[PDB]
Symmetry: C3
Subunit: 532 residues, 3 copies
């Protein structure tokens, strides 16, 4: 037909029509719409600013660059998570505050379809919005799908602890994109009055953070955190961050005389100079030699004083904040493969023992934060059963998946429920046929596995069993319904109990049926252990 | 008793200078800043108001000319200068200055018409210090202002998007005009009677300002000499991104996105960009390669701010600011100066149908004639005498018509049909100030009227009494236009307005009116191009 | 109990309680409160901007860096003037617009104690606020003592003579601090309505300058210049400064095409690059080989058009400016040791003679500005007495101390007096026990010798005779009383005649008694000599 030409606040944007198998109405797709001014030069380490308005018709027809991040880890994660046929090779640039829109609406008429904003994950160190294709979800459930990008690593989370560089640039970028949604989405047949944000892992945590943030108030109306919340310690730095700032500054070749000096010095560095420092900082990998308490796995969220007025924990204490329908879920085996693999865990033997375990758990301090003293008591409550090493090692991985996502997600769900807001929980237990070959065939419900169902991978990729195609159809219906009514339920779908005092949740997979008190036993155990 | 005028930003000190046979000495101020130096981050951005100074700024030294090829720059300065000694100039990104020549007695109120001169140089070279206003100012009693604007990459670099729209140079130009409105009164000038005039690219600029919304109300009479907004070579229509990327790669930059390019270039040093400017090989006719790829230079673009759409489209609707507009050309635009500089293969002094058609093709950037129509055009002009040397000249007329000839006339007509006072002229004279290397058969070579217009005869030496008179006449004519929007006046031949009869003025040894200038050629090309 | 936490305009500030021998109420000490935004990057060579407000509680508990200067010369001066026990080694940085506060007030209650702002000296090329400890003065006289810093050297006084870099950045920095005191000092139990500014040497000159500046109007209510005023030539550049600018630019490796080109080119230079140029420019040292008229001893105040509308001489002509109680004083032997020492004066023979003298006086042109023709007439009026060479030297040194501080100070005093404003003069003649060993015991009242009494060095240092302890007790009472009522006098202290037509001043030291017409004979002599 004819290229779509929507009219936004900063000017006209031109897209491209794409049809999905067995769908009359073609989906309008705009790739690379800028939602802010490039954070280059002096804008680095500062909040994002409004984008400059353009004069004619901007061609939103090319995949925007992904924020600077280690190019290997980045491309890799893009392949293992992409829900599309071909993995699109991406480019790197500080100029990355862009978002992609997938609208199933017939733009020739008014339309106010629920909007779903996806915040990709990647430990806040890597990732990209272009990885996730919204064609399917948009087509199948009739919702406008928007994929946003935000500053990562040093660029998006470098913090000096003071006003010279507060931090959370990335989250601010996120908040920025949501403001863009409020002021424009209507021109793409979406209802700015019904926005639903949902993210996975670091993306999920972001969502949990926004729910806590004062700035995010009124920018969304329903939230969904998948495999990650604001209590996932590894992503939130509590304590004096000055030391890390100083390390980074030094690694980049900077004086550390004062905060203002460090920030300045760094603003002078070239992107490559900073990408080079990142690599040197050796993030994203498990340090096996050195004090586990000094190892810094990433540059995460902080209590800046603008986005987060206090530790997530304290915050959720007072239900006095913006409470909305919130769906919090986790996967059966979060630490089953994908992560212990990308980080390079000493598990080539495929077996473990009390001694080796306790040592690992200790060296895994940055990820779980368990005191060297309590290590023994924890390693036991989980590995003290069967003497079977291979079982102990499989229990070891559960040990971590519980402290990182399990308990945290449930604790967040509960406080949200007791806040008086509609809460739902789920536990995805399935092994997508899209898994990597290298991932054992026994590992089911690994980290990011639900992604394929959620983004309709079966309808864009190849080889989906008729069983998997159905699983995806259901999950989307469920997700889209939430986006619509703050309740996943609807006819033709199993019943999803609300997460109330009974604590009912939904086990999703080959066999989808409700249950209760998810990880209840674990939340109880860890809570005391940590109480010392 | 140095002149000390008071402007909005502060006091400016100049210098008095007397001209032969004129009681009143002319106050001359060299180097007044009309904008904040576009250095650092200000590069590739619109010009900003200059910082106001505290005491008395000494406007007594020729300001630097914007960065540009020092060789091509200095050479043009000599070949066009209307003064005795050429003044060697300096290069710098800090060049947003203007010079003023006021014949008024600053001890009294005076509101003399103002004439703002926009030098030319293909938007690549040139300076305002080259042209001296002493003469024109004293002789016709008008305040003369010479402005400078960013050239080359510094002034026309465009990414085609909001990250670097382009036309920085033209924006500087508008900047200067705003300055004149808020200050020229302090130099005995009438801010309500400002006339802009340029030569070549400057002529084009003047034509662009007439189409631009931003220029509305900053001038009241316009004059385009050998160049308008339809002189294709100077206006970039089409996706400019490609050229941006090439430039960016040449200077050693990533081309990831638009923002990235602009940012990386902002970081480059002046020398770095001047170096890139040379590498890009602008101003030189590329004889080997696809003529549709050779980029003659960086020019005007349709940015969305200065020009809301192509000049052609704009002049369609007479709904814009219409003012008395004088549009002229010279007998032989492509006679020597232009071809000589770009180094042309006419070292043989003769051509032939085959060779011609090839050149015309390799001159695509200059004329923009499709390889299919080339044969049909090469004929309509060279199809007569078999004399090669005659073809070698008919060839030069061929270019002179597509570049200035027809375009100028087309612009004149649309303005006329807009309901505005329009005048045209055709200068046919060989100044005694021409270069030696210039063949004495060329009469009306590009930029020949400049010597007459700026009274070169009264500043230089050896002007025949016949030339002195031609100059006296042109200025009178120009000045009158600046005064009433009509060149006519007593003591001058009659200059018919450019209405339906299309009367224009042939100027030179024998100055008399005529009609339908290039009429035959306008008609021809118009269709050829209609394919 | 623990930590004081004041609340300022830009956010809360946390300090530390320090008790002084024999004083109940502990003094609240805040070190390093920012009063302006770091003048880094593009902000270099531009007026200082308001500081960025912070989010939580800033820890004002570390000595701020001292502005970029000669680390050797800097630390050395720090030692020779510090009133505290241990000299505190400082750090260098362009980020240095900080001030330190010492408030004896009980912050748990409202208090409006007179405020005393100290502007350290150092020839505008070196120095720092951390050198001077306000604990004593604050405690002993119950005044809030504030020590400020301001850009020195190229960073604070680089001028192009035009609007592209007017200059006096350092003096604007000073004014900025005072505005900060107006808008904040109240929160430290200070009376923003009773601020007194006082400085020694270059700091004294600055005080003298703010008294003439329109920008300083209403930021203070009493002034005190110690050994330095606006007529101390060496510190004020009158004439075309462009030449010097260009030299500096050339030395730093810059094009001098235009003023704006030079400023821009310099902004690009790194701190080290500029520190390196500062060193090459061989400042603060006496050039013995070259035209004395070209030697530039330092970068100083200039007639910018903002801070100073015209030369101090012209300005003081019209009493039409802000007149306030002004105490101007000098030391018995300003040029006795310290300076000739630091500047490296050839006097290693400890003796001189008419010929040698006239040559030095000439080569000391930058410091005194005596034309080569008048040199003979001046060298005589002073050395013409005794044929004793060693006396000629002592006399030679007096010759200088009078042209640089003697006369200048008295002239400033008189004009201020004839303006109708309360004026007081003093002559300090004492040899502190804290002097350097290298300082001959003959010398008394060397440059900056009054500092030890003024800042209560005897109460923080060791070895103060009971005679010295008293001298200090007295000086502070005097200074403090002034800060309080614009009149040093009070009961328990000698009488200090106001500086009226009788021209009564106060000789201070072992024997403190009034006198009259200070340097009167010299003011008269040099006035004509200079009139040629
Ligand atoms: C939020 C969990 C996470 C992840 C992760 C995020 C989303 C999906 C899958 C994994 C991670 C880990 C390592 C990595 O690259 C290692 C480089 N190698 C290729 C050498 C890239 C991403 C993480 C856990 C602890 C510390 C830091 C990040
Ligand atoms: C603990 C389950 C496991 C893992 C595993 C390790 C870390 C995280 C998650 C899983 C495994 C998989 C592949 C492997 O090596 C392939 C050869 N290349 C390295 C060249 C080594 C170890 C395993 C499965 C079956 C048999 C033996 C071990
Ligand atoms: C608008 C016509 C013009 C001119 C011109 C403008 C005003 C007066 C005279 C000539 C031009 C040509 C060559 C040149 O430099 C060659 C030096 N070396 C590179 C050899 C500098 C300027 C031009 C024509 C075609 C392409 C680009 C510009
Ligand atoms: C078309 C005008 C031209 C030109 C010319 C062409 C392009 C640019 C600049 C100048 C010319 C003139 C002299 C010359 O060589 C002299 C050395 N020896 C070989 C004599 C070579 C070419 C010309 C003028 C008169 C007669 C014939 C041609
Ligand atoms: C305004 C009087 C002053 C002083 C001064 C200021 C306050 C207290 C004591 C001395 C000065 C002199 C030399 C010096 O360092 C030499 C380093 N070398 C050993 C390398 C540092 C400061 C001065 C006099 C003339 C020109 C420049 C400054
Ligand atoms: C002007 C007071 C002065 C000075 C002095 C010179 C320049 C700057 C500051 C002080 C002095 C001190 C010691 C000296 O030599 C020691 C070598 N020994 C082997 C003796 C030479 C000169 C002096 C003091 C006492 C007696 C004579 C002169
Ligand atoms: C630079 C580039 O080649 N990519 C395209 C960009 C991209 O959309 C953004 O850089 C990221 O999406 O936008 C354009 O289409 C446009 O504004 O007209 C230009 C170009 O075609
Ligand atoms: C080389 C140059 O142009 N700079 C000069 C500027 C000019 O005013 C402007 O640049 C415009 O001429 O200021 C001076 O003239 C001056 O006031 O002493 C000296 C300086 O050299
Ligand atoms: C970098 C450094 O160690 N200095 C200190 C600075 C100071 O403000 C000034 O730099 C000098 O006191 O910041 C703190 O005070 C702060 O607000 O937390 C603590 C920090 O220790
Ligand atoms: C934008 O896309 C349209 C497709 O209809 C195309 O015509 C246009 O040239 C594109 N923009 C550019 C100049 O790349
Ligand atoms: C500020 O001071 C308090 C107490 O002295 C201390 O607990 C806190 O950690 C300090 N902040 C800094 C600089 O880390
Ligand atoms: C004008 O004044 C400046 C200083 O005010 C002086 O240096 C200059 O010599 C004078 N003009 C010139 C350069 O002739």
């Amino acid at each position: 037909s004819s290229p779509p030409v929507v009219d936004t606040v900063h000017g006209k944007v031109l897209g491209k029509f794409v049809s999905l198998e067995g769908f009359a109405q073609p989906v309008a797709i705009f790739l690379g719409i800028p939602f802010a001014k490039p954070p280059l030069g002096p804008l680095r380490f500062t909040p994002p600013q409004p984008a400059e308005p353009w004069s004619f018709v901007k061609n939103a027809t090319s995949y925007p660059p992904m924020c600077t991040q280690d190019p290997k880890a980045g491309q890799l994660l893009s392949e293992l998570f992409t829900n599309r046929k071909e993995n699109i090779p991406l480019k790197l640039s500080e100029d990355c505050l862009y978002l992609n829109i997938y609208t199933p609406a017939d733009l020739t008429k008014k339309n106010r379809l629920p909007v779903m904003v996806w915040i990709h994950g990647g430990g806040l160190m890597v990732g990209a919005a272009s990885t996730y294709d919204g064609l399917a979800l948009a087509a199948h459930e009739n919702v406008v799908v928007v994929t946003i990008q935000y500053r990562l690593g040093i660029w998006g989370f470098f913090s000096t602890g003071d006003e010279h560089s507060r931090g959370n640039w990335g989250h601010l970028d996120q908040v920025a994109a949501l403001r863009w949604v409020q002021d424009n989405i209507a021109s793409f047949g979406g209802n700015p009055g019904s926005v639903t944000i949902f993210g996975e892992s670091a993306g999920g945590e972001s969502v949990s953070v926004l729910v806590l943030s004062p700035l995010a108030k009124n920018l969304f109306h329903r939230a969904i955190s998948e495999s990650g919340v604001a209590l996932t310690s590894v992503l939130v730095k509590k304590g004096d961050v000055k030391p890390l700032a100083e390390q980074i500054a030094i690694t980049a070749g900077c004086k550390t005389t004062t905060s203002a000096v460090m920030v300045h010095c760094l603003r002078q560095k070239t992107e490559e100079e900073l990408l080079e420092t990142t690599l040197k900082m050796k993030f994203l990998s498990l340090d096996l030699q050195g004090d586990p308490r000094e190892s810094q796995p990433l540059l995460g969220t902080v209590i800046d004083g603008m986005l987060l007025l206090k530790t997530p924990e304290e915050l959720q204490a007072e239900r006095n904040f913006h409470t909305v329908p919130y769906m919090v879920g986790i996967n059966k085996q979060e630490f089953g493969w994908l992560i212990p693999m990308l980080m390079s865990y000493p598990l080539s033997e495929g077996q473990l023992d009390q001694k080796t375990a306790m040592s690992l758990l200790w060296k895994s301090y940055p990820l779980v934060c368990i005191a060297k003293e309590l290590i023994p008591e924890a390693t036991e409550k989980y590995l003290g059963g069967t003497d079977d090493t291979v079982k102990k090692k499989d229990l070891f991985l559960d040990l971590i998946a519980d402290v990182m996502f399990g308990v945290p997600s449930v604790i967040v769900a509960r406080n949200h429920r007791d806040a008086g807001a509609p809460t739902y929980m789920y536990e995805f237990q399935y092994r997508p046929s899209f898994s990597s070959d290298m991932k054992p065939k026994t590992v089911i419900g690994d980290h990011g596995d639900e992604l394929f169902s959620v983004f309709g991978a079966p309808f864009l990729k190849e080889g989906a069993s008729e069983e998997e195609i159905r699983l995806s159809k259901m999950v989307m219906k469920f997700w889209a319904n939430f986006a619509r009514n703050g309740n996943p339920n609807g006819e033709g779908l199993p019943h999803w109990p609300e997460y109330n005092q009974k604590e009912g949740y939904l086990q999703i997979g080959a066999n989808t049926q409700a249950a209760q008190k998810l990880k209840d036993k674990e939340v109880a155990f860890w809570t005391n252990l940590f109480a010392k």
